[PDB]
Design a protein around this ligand. Structure first.
Ligand SMILES: NC(=O)c1ccc[n+]([C@@H]2O[C@H](COP(=O)([O-])OP(=O)(O)OC[C@H]3O[C@@H](n4cnc5c(N)ncnc54)[C@H](O)[C@@H]3O)[C@@H](O)[C@H]2O)c1
Ligand SMILES: NC(=O)c1ccc[n+]([C@@H]2O[C@H](COP(=O)([O-])OP(=O)(O)OC[C@H]3O[C@@H](n4cnc5c(N)ncnc54)[C@H](O)[C@@H]3O)[C@@H](O)[C@H]2O)c1
Ligand SMILES: NC(=O)c1ccc[n+]([C@@H]2O[C@H](COP(=O)([O-])OP(=O)(O)OC[C@H]3O[C@@H](n4cnc5c(N)ncnc54)[C@H](O)[C@@H]3O)[C@@H](O)[C@H]2O)c1
Ligand SMILES: NC(=O)c1ccc[n+]([C@@H]2O[C@H](COP(=O)([O-])OP(=O)(O)OC[C@H]3O[C@@H](n4cnc5c(N)ncnc54)[C@H](O)[C@@H]3O)[C@@H](O)[C@H]2O)c1
Ligand SMILES: C=C(c1ccc(F)c(O)c1)c1cccc(-c2cccc(O)c2F)n1
Ligand SMILES: C=C(c1ccc(F)c(O)c1)c1cccc(-c2cccc(O)c2F)n1
Ligand SMILES: C=C(c1ccc(F)c(O)c1)c1cccc(-c2cccc(O)c2F)n1
Ligand SMILES: C=C(c1ccc(F)c(O)c1)c1cccc(-c2cccc(O)c2F)n1
Ligand SMILES: OC[C@H]1O[C@@H](O)[C@H](O)[C@@H](O)[C@@H]1O
Ligand SMILES: OC[C@H]1O[C@@H](O)[C@H](O)[C@@H](O)[C@@H]1O
Ligand SMILES: OC[C@H]1O[C@@H](O)[C@H](O)[C@@H](O)[C@@H]1O
Ligand SMILES: OC[C@H]1O[C@@H](O)[C@H](O)[C@@H](O)[C@@H]1O
Ligand code: NA
Ligand code: NA
Ligand code: NA
Ligand code: NA
Lengths: 256, 256, 256, 256
């Protein structure tokens, strides 16, 4: 309740899924939180539910939306300590030949350039507060994923960008880290599974992809984010895996 | 002279630097090589110099240029075995606040989407030949670099994309690998150093950034590419470091 | 004060340095802590200082010492939830030709097999409590270090062993993670620096090896350990870097 | 036939499996090769088969055997250019509680200290020749393996040691690299599979653990070793994966 008292946090895509779990974790640590989302439904209800969280409608791909997000955060709360770049999307499975450069550009706009834009606009205020940036990347940026060339590329970019920016902002006391979740049970996971011939089988495979035998929860990503913000003062440029061990060992993926 | 005899290779940005070193290595291994470049000067001279190499003017950011590159390769040589996605650029040092989303998009077009586009157009022919893709990424995609947020992000994306595509194309016998060079002495390195207050000091630092005490050569990247194409039949999705050890150990980058 | 209330933690080498910082962090989170050390001086004073910590003399290289450590922990506190394998040593700088197989074996006994032995003896009790293992490895296991072949090898082994054991113990709900610190200001760091021709210069270099410009603190490693024990329920087999960014970018470590 | 002409190579455990594939690759590149093995059967036959290879009986865990191996290589061939530390063993599957510290020590003697000992005794001659070291580690040192805590630990140590030694020997022009194979079809693989309830099923799983759908061959590891020795002049401290992509993506290894 006090680990991050008196601090101000912006969470993009905070209306549902991982983002909402990160919102709740920061509120529970004593922070005031600005929920940014392009859709009103979840975020507006979360603002009613949580004292200390407020909702601001903002599409992170629209630069003037993000400019307003930052200026309204400062106007209303007087400081900015942490930005969590969580907004992002996973398209359905697509074979390489079914992808397009246009679709690839549009996904880069959300998953990469939206993170870039908010970070850039927030950094002057984070420097004043010796605050920090937390990017939500993905395990599959590191190890790959099938039928997801554009998504994997965007997350490779986020993880790498995190390290570059950590180098540049270290002289100013601003840390820049990322979390790479694996399979987290969210509305996006549920939506993608419902597209499959056997959704139930897809979900069962997703649970057994982890040595721990289950998918992760938004609250567990949220706890990792609170750690990075509030207690990881000698961490910068790290990639914090929240994956249940999916990257470990051999699995189903004589010598001719 | 025979390790890759009878094979056909496309090298983008093959007119100078690393690309020209890769062109020479493949010619020396017995392959026929198509030199793709947006500038004529170097590539046209290389075509005159090397029996077995020919030059095709092609800007990899222009989709119809790349369509023509592939169709002309097939028309002239009847097969395609390896594409080397080397074309790319490093902008001058830029502090994060000096970058723009527009500049970032333009660098993504070259360093990432140009690699994507040629790979996509070539894959039908690589499937027929059980050929392979070699992407030239960078060490700094893995470890970061100062004053280079956009460049680092693009190379993070290339390395990650390499792994995704290796997964998707493995059922068809097409391997997809990347090389991550460190400091290689090229015209781009020389151009960037000439921008500095003390170019000579910049070059000296660049040499001592490697435990081996020197920068790398285009020929050394070229040898790694020939290995991946011709002898690495159980390698796919790997990142082959050609860096002189720059990523090893501690260097210049009490507890408060 | 309550994040790990009611839990019982063993910290090896807890008498000073990183180990004592981990002891304090767990006490501050509400846990009861058993301080294991081969030397009495620091650990006995820490037991007097901290309600909720007690000292047990134990050399982790002596199997019967470790057997007694575990049985006394259970006898006195009735459960065991977390073991932190921190005991370890860094020999002075040694050129490869100045090392011996005998010295290498002895360092393996402490840095690797002592971690192995306590983990093995504790696992039956950790299974009952759904507890967890935290190994203190090092950044240099991942990236190397000069004049330290035996030390680097031992830490490579610890990090790898962490992943293997995480796989084996995941069906039982026992997580196994490691922390890889970089330069942490401790008595061992101070002792090694005092061996150098210019200790002050050695310490200054050690501070500037991190983008953050300082060495880390035992308290910061301790906070990472409390996170892994108490809040990282979907993390297993991870390597949590606490290094101030030392692994990022180029530093001091034309093409002939 | 000429890539490594006039050079002298020692391959430990060269009598069968990966080691014999590395022997053949170097002979085919023009090198003279000393086959070291503790068993005579395979290595003696290979010496009869291959002009340019000779067999020396040597147990790499016995220091005087290794001293004699080096002195006999120099006495007979007058130089030493490359040592390939391939000798090693994988014990049968063992649950953590079924392992012993004694068994762990014995495996460290072979997989780690035997590599250390030959490297140390060879380095004076490698410095004279500007030669290189190639260690055969394993993919599972990086990602873990089930029921193999001691084996995984030894390979974690080898990979890490490779980087440390590359740092120390770089001022002298001696490169130190490792190869991390995945599933390679060898007599050891066949022996381990025959221990299983369903050997055929074990072998089928082993083939499908790779995106490429097969196990690797000793010849493919051998080609990687020849590359590292003869053409990778700007590579030191690297880990060259020869795994068929087993480390990529998700596999078989809702949120509670
Ligand atoms: N769910 C997983 O298993 C998983 C795994 C790894 C990484 N991730 C990453 O975590 C993040 C969140 O994923 P999730 O599963 O919670 O997804 P989700 O779809 O359930 O929630 C994403 C939220 O972001 C919002 N959003 C989308 N586009 C936006 C935009 N342009 N501007 C503002 N808000 C926008 C959505 O409206 C939604 O509220 C994404 O970056 C995703 O790539 C998810
Ligand atoms: N030089 C290094 O130290 C270094 C290190 C790591 C990675 N790399 C990468 O290696 C690649 C080559 O770098 P370099 O140093 O040889 O650079 P360079 O500038 O010397 O050569 C690049 C070549 O690509 C061509 N090119 C540029 N844009 C193109 C386009 N749109 N279409 C076609 N051709 C185009 C240029 O005309 C030039 O001939 C790049 O991807 C770079 O990021 C270089
Ligand atoms: N200090 C750093 O920069 C640094 C960096 C990376 C990793 N580490 C690791 O962190 C751990 C602690 O390092 P530190 O700097 O705090 O060292 P330290 O020497 O200051 O403290 C180590 C403690 O362990 C105890 N110990 C040593 N051998 C023991 C044994 N056989 N049985 C029981 N206790 C034993 C010592 O008596 C001492 O109290 C070690 O594993 C070290 O490798 C340290
Ligand atoms: N086969 C795989 O899938 C695989 C995968 C990754 C790594 N590796 C590694 O590759 C290496 C070779 O494995 P392999 O499958 O070819 O094994 P193998 O058992 O088929 O061959 C190993 C050879 O080493 C010899 N040897 C064993 N102990 C020795 C000693 N003390 N001194 C000298 N020679 C000794 C054996 O007699 C044998 O000829 C080992 O280091 C192993 O860990 C193998
Ligand atoms: C949201 C998904 C996801 C899963 C793991 C990650 F690491 C990540 O970043 C996102 C998800 C959920 C179900 C299916 C898929 C999916 C989509 C396209 C191609 C695939 O191979 C998938 F598994 N992703
Ligand atoms: C071309 C350069 C380069 C160097 C190393 C790499 F890994 C890479 O991919 C590219 C280069 C050469 C000189 C200077 C710089 C440079 C540019 C901007 C920011 C920096 O920190 C730089 F070192 N890059
Ligand atoms: C205790 C030291 C240390 C530093 C960094 C690490 F990641 C680590 O695990 C331990 C330390 C402190 C001062 C000097 C040295 C040292 C010792 C031998 C060889 C070297 O290159 C060193 F830097 N280590
Ligand atoms: C020789 C085996 C092996 C397989 C992959 C590697 F990366 C490696 O270094 C060695 C092998 C072959 C069959 C079975 C096993 C095995 C043994 C014990 C535990 C396991 O989980 C295994 F797969 N290893
Ligand atoms: O829809 C899948 C899951 O999404 C998560 O974000 C919610 O917290 C869960 O209540 C829900 O079951
Ligand atoms: O311009 C720097 C270097 O670029 C390389 O591509 C050329 O091969 C060298 O001859 C030249 O010195
Ligand atoms: O000796 C170096 C440092 O060691 C740490 O363990 C102590 O907490 C510090 O007080 C001390 O300055
Ligand atoms: O025994 C398994 C395999 O081992 C390899 O070392 C041999 O080259 C193969 O001929 C054999 O099939
Ligand atoms: Na509210
Ligand atoms: Na020509
Ligand atoms: Na006490
Ligand atoms: Na012979």
């Amino acid at each position: 309740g006090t680990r991050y008292a008196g601090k101000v946090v912006v969470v993009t895509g905070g209306g549902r899924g991982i983002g909402a779990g990160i919102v709740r974790a920061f509120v529970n640590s004593g922070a005031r939180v600005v929920i940014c989302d392009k859709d009103e439904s979840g975020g507006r209800a979360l603002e009613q539910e949580l004292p200390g969280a407020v909702f601001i409608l903002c599409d992170v791909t629209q630069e003037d939306d993000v400019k307003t997000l930052v200026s309204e955060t400062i106007r209303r709360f007087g400081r900015l300590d942490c930005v969590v770049n969580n907004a992002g999307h996973h398209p359905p499975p697509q074979r390489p030949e079914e992808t397009s450069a246009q679709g690839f550009r549009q996904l880069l706009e959300l998953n990469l350039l939206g993170t870039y834009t908010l970070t850039k606009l927030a950094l002057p205020y984070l420097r004043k507060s010796q605050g920090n940036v937390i990017n939500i990347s993905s395990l599959v940026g590191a190890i790959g994923q099938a039928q997801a060339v554009p998504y994997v590329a965007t997350k490779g970019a986020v993880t790498a960008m995190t390290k570059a920016l950590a180098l540049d902002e270290s002289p100013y006391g601003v840390r820049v880290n990322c979390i790479s979740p694996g399979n987290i049970w969210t509305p996006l996971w549920e939506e993608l599974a419902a597209l499959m011939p056997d959704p139930r089988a897809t979900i069962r495979e997703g649970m057994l992809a982890q040595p721990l035998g289950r998918m992760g929860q938004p609250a567990e990503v949220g706890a990792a984010a609170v750690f990075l913000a509030s207690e990881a003062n000698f961490c910068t440029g790290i990639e914090l895996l929240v994956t249940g061990g999916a990257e470990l060992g051999y699995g189903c993926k004589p010598d001719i």
